Design a protein around this motif. Structure first.
Motif, PDB file in Angstrom:
ATOM      1  N   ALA A 193    -101.714  15.207 -48.814  1.00 47.54           N
ATOM      2  CA  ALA A 193    -100.560  17.081 -48.622  1.00 47.54           C
ATOM      3  C   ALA A 193     -99.733  16.369 -47.500  1.00 47.54           C
ATOM      4  O   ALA A 193     -99.686  15.452 -46.362  1.00 47.54           O
ATOM      5  CB  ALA A 193    -101.934  17.788 -47.665  1.00 47.54           C
ATOM      6  N   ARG A 194     -98.908  17.939 -47.748  1.00 49.54           N
ATOM      7  CA  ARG A 194     -97.428  17.124 -46.836  1.00 49.54           C
ATOM      8  C   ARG A 194     -97.089  18.833 -46.250  1.00 49.54           C
ATOM      9  O   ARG A 194     -96.938  19.392 -47.446  1.00 49.54           O
ATOM     10  CB  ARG A 194     -96.380  16.281 -46.644  1.00 49.54           C
ATOM     11  N   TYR A 195     -96.251  19.042 -45.575  1.00 46.05           N
ATOM     12  CA  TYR A 195     -95.568  20.607 -44.962  1.00 46.05           C
ATOM     13  C   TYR A 195     -94.795  20.148 -43.832  1.00 46.05           C
ATOM     14  O   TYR A 195     -94.569  19.169 -43.672  1.00 46.05           O
ATOM     15  CB  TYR A 195     -97.164  21.690 -44.461  1.00 46.05           C
ATOM     16  N   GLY A 196     -94.117  20.891 -44.250  1.00 43.16           N
ATOM     17  CA  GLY A 196     -93.029  21.360 -42.708  1.00 43.16           C
ATOM     18  C   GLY A 196     -91.728  22.197 -43.456  1.00 43.16           C
ATOM     19  O   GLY A 196     -92.491  23.693 -43.384  1.00 43.16           O
ATOM     20  N   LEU A 215     -90.718  17.097 -43.456  1.00 40.20           N
ATOM     21  CA  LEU A 215     -92.607  17.528 -43.790  1.00 40.20           C
ATOM     22  C   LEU A 215     -93.187  16.400 -43.023  1.00 40.20           C
ATOM     23  O   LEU A 215     -92.812  14.941 -43.158  1.00 40.20           O
ATOM     24  CB  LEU A 215     -92.478  17.101 -45.494  1.00 40.20           C
TER      25      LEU A 215
END
Ligand SMILES: O=c1[nH]c(=O)c2nn[nH]c2[nH]1
Ligand SMILES: O=c1[nH]c(=O)c2nn[nH]c2[nH]1
Ligand SMILES: O=c1[nH]c(=O)c2nn[nH]c2[nH]1
Ligand SMILES: O=c1[nH]c(=O)c2nn[nH]c2[nH]1
Ligand code: NA
Ligand code: NA
Ligand code: NA
Ligand code: NA
Ligand SMILES: [Xe]
Ligand SMILES: [Xe]
Ligand SMILES: [Xe]
Ligand SMILES: [Xe]
Lengths: 295, 295, 295, 295
Positions: free
Chosen positions: B6-9, B37
């Motif tokens: 999972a990665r987010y940004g 991210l």
């Protein structure tokens, strides 16, 4: 019902031509995208399914390549005029040709401070364009342009003294970023035909160069009161330097860069005199146009 | 089911920064597009609707502007490393930051042969990019690149001696146009942390310049046997000039320009030695890649 | 220096195929864009200018058309597997083929409530894609995806309870617009070869349909706590419905729509419960990813 | 020099509006991109740096949001007329407003065969557009259009009987693929002002629907002799169904799909009656236009 207007042809015809100097070994390349649309006595192809009047768009494509093979493709004003004239002379029932040409940059590479004989770089997406309308019995009308010239100055732009009413939130400013993509068009006096266009050939490249130079210098040097005021100064100078131009038109987006208030974070100062980091805005954008002619 | 990765940004964060020399009055501008991210102990935001672990993407955006305000933004390798390190040091549960930066060209204008203090032009859509992965306990991995460098040579390219079977129609050639858009990436040896990245700061701009120069010179000068052979020569030279690079990767489209046979029209000769007008092909295109490392 | 990795082939190969039912007169069209990249014992083309190892990219293009002529092009998972297998079986020294296919929508028109036999509309730029890696001695790995599915819900999205610190300005919310472009990928268990892919043919279209339906229903019905929480629910359901999928990956931009405070103008109320007019933001955008697999 | 023409304003203003039915709970969304350009007694802003005549483009942006808040935004013909009229009534020295609106599709989702109250999908990049010119003392001129409607038919298109000369290579055909992106514009009779536009409100959506339906049906059903003949049939029908339209204009690219001769490969038959696999051509393309009015 009746056909009030009709035109048809071929769009997006990509063409490359190379010139090879046998003596020096130097090669020069030209790349363009060409569109040709024809008008004339072609109504019956629409109303009666009469294809006998149609010069096939595939044939128009062939004609562009053949014309490029047999003629110089520079300056584009000349090539467009040759191409347009061909259709009105060749086909009795065709009475107008509309030719648009976009010229792509292939700039000779410098390798070790020397110009390379056959290697090129695309330095920017700036284009040089022409629109040529060849109308039987009415001569040749040519509009030359540059587009996609993207510039920015980080100071020496102001905007104050505008109308303020209940719709206004914009603060007056004495120091802002100004950035735009320049679209500039100069319209030539009508030419009687190919012989006259040929007689003016040296003026085409020179006027393009002048338009570019005036645009860049004025943008860089004007302490700009508005986009409106700066663009007028550009158009004025172009008209002064080439008497064969009748009008100059500029269309300029105002690509906004917004201050970012960071004071909420540890009193960080990033506005007015302290502004260093800005947020470029992709949209919306101001759009400012003007057409300048002779008194 | 389980969260495997999972990665987010925040993506597409446009940033402009100006530097003003008070002494000389010279201003210098930088414009970039940034993506950050994050990874770490954030699974519960996906599986349990636990937002307590989420550093809001809006906060990541704020952090990019604040970091740009307080630090130099050049070379981008340094800025990316500062930005990435911030997140792993600030937030206990964040263990990796992935920072991508695209630098846009704003080249100082020359007006009357002199560099202008505050006016700039976008000379081409060529980009200088960095990808920085900051991973807690594993240091800083940096990949630097240039992209969107579009070149063409009109001769001194060959392609013969390839495999011929029942699927082959391509004729061998000893003289063709070669044109490509260069994407070149050099991967730095792993750095232990910010102190080490700082210690190498002068190498970043110099290596970018070297990569660009080697690419252009080799392309212009190689009597190319194939895209494959020419690109290998480029990568070889880059590795030889900078020992801190571990690998060089090139990805090159072969943008085709086709001869046009015009012999059907009045025996017009436009192929082989007589080829002057060509049809640039928008698609399909060859795509050739290679990654070169040390023996 | 040494070649660490290399692949080459043809990109952006547009292909259309029509099927004609002689009995019913119904015609069905398929249009795709195909990329094929090969790997194998080809290092010498880079290092020694040895073209004898190169299957020309022009030949790869020919092969794609020939393969489309002789085989079904649907489902794309099957076509990609046939195309990839061809290269590893035909050429001794080629050991991997990487095939990417993008399928474009041509949806049969309904005219007067009846399906038309031979007329089609492009209803949206949504794509169905496949990536097929055929590796000699390691079988066939297939990743199927949908992309460019753009959706918006005007309420029933919340975002509160996130981390708040000195970098945070974002207000918590219990009612916001949520809009995204869906990119969803499902990775199949490894297949031993073509026979096994053929044996599962009916599952490919059904699983695509299921992925699409689950995505749309979950988006519409979830009272969303975050993009993270909603996307996890989607992936969970897909994995539950098709045991031959190993992982599901979603990559979702959060396309922001901002309230516009109009209170400065005659106390006009346009925020919170009174929000009716919003400003869609082109950039920046949140980007949220996750890969979900089996416990 | 003198200002011959001038207009300025704000482009690319993205606007979203939601309507909430309190009774049913059903929500309906509208999203548009708006451009407003003004003309009037503004020459001095260009020639004398007199900003007092300038309604700031930022204020124009504010006005668009305020107008959207206080008025319906559908049909776009009405909204454009309200917005244009505002500027000529509010500002003494502004004498013309030019409003362009592009409406983006947000189509209500069907979940389990039922319309969802608040979830939407972008089904295609087809647009519905308006251009409204409000000129003081000359009323309101409205051109309505649809664009980006992309269609293909796989048979029932012919092209034979065209002019053949020494520039022609195209073979006559009795069965070809026809594919285009439809741009259709209908121009309304001049309206005296807002009251008259309001009186015709129901006709705007109905005429758009009729134009779309006639376009699709005619394309699907015509055994087309040429693009020219088919488009004329479309325009004829639209004019017959709405007496308040003065002219209809179509502009249609002819997006070519070429046969691929595969006979070189094992005598494979893929042309004429045996054609199954084709190569879509990205460029060049035919471009065919016509404007049809009343006898
Ligand atoms: O429908 C067509 N109209 C044309 O004018 C044309 N020219 N080439 N092919 C064509 N097809
Ligand atoms: O759904 C969301 N997820 C996030 O991570 C986020 N960050 N800001 N807004 C957000 N919305
Ligand atoms: O330089 C080239 N490399 C290749 O692999 C190739 N294939 N066709 N043409 C080509 N040119
Ligand atoms: O130069 C400008 N001209 C304008 O008309 C304007 N309106 N807002 N900002 C502006 N800047
Ligand atoms: Na004539
Ligand atoms: Na940490
Ligand atoms: Na093999
Ligand atoms: Na007025
Ligand atoms: Xe300007
Ligand atoms: Xe190259
Ligand atoms: Xe979502
Ligand atoms: Xe058509």
């Amino acid at each position: 019902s009746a056909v009030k207007a009709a035109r048809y042809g071929k769009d997006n015809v990509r063409v490359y031509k190379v010139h090879k100097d046998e003596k020096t070994g130097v090669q020069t390349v030209y790349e363009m995208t060409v569109c040709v649309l024809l008008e004339g006595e072609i109504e019956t192809s629409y109303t009666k399914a009469d294809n006998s009047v149609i010069v096939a768009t595939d044939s128009i494509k062939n004609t562009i390549y053949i014309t490029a093979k047999q003629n110089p493709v520079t300056p584009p004003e000349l090539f467009g005029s040759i191409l347009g004239t061909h259709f009105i002379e060749k086909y009795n029932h065709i009475h107008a040709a509309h030719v648009n040409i976009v010229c792509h940059r292939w700039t000779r590479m410098d390798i070790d401070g020397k110009p390379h004989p056959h290697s090129f770089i695309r330095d920017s997406e700036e284009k040089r364009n022409v629109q040529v309308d060849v109308v039987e019995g009415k001569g040749i009308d040519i509009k030359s342009s540059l587009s996609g010239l993207t510039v920015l100055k980080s100071t020496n732009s102001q905007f104050w003294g505008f109308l303020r009413d209940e719709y206004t939130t914009l603060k007056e400013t004495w120091d802002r970023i100004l950035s735009t993509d320049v679209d500039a068009t100069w319209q030539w006096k009508n030419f009687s035909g190919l012989q006259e266009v040929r007689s003016h050939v040296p003026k085409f490249d020179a006027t393009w160069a002048t338009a570019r130079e005036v645009t860049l210098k004025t943008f860089a040097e004007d302490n700009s009161a508005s986009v409106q005021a700066t663009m007028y100064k550009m158009a004025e100078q172009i008209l002064a330097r080439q008497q064969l131009i009748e009008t100059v038109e500029y269309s300029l987006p105002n690509k906004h860069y917004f201050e970012i208030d960071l004071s909420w974070h540890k009193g960080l100062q990033n506005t007015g005199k302290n502004a260093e980091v800005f947020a470029p805005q992709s949209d919306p954008n101001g759009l400012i146009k003007c057409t300048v002619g002779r008194s």
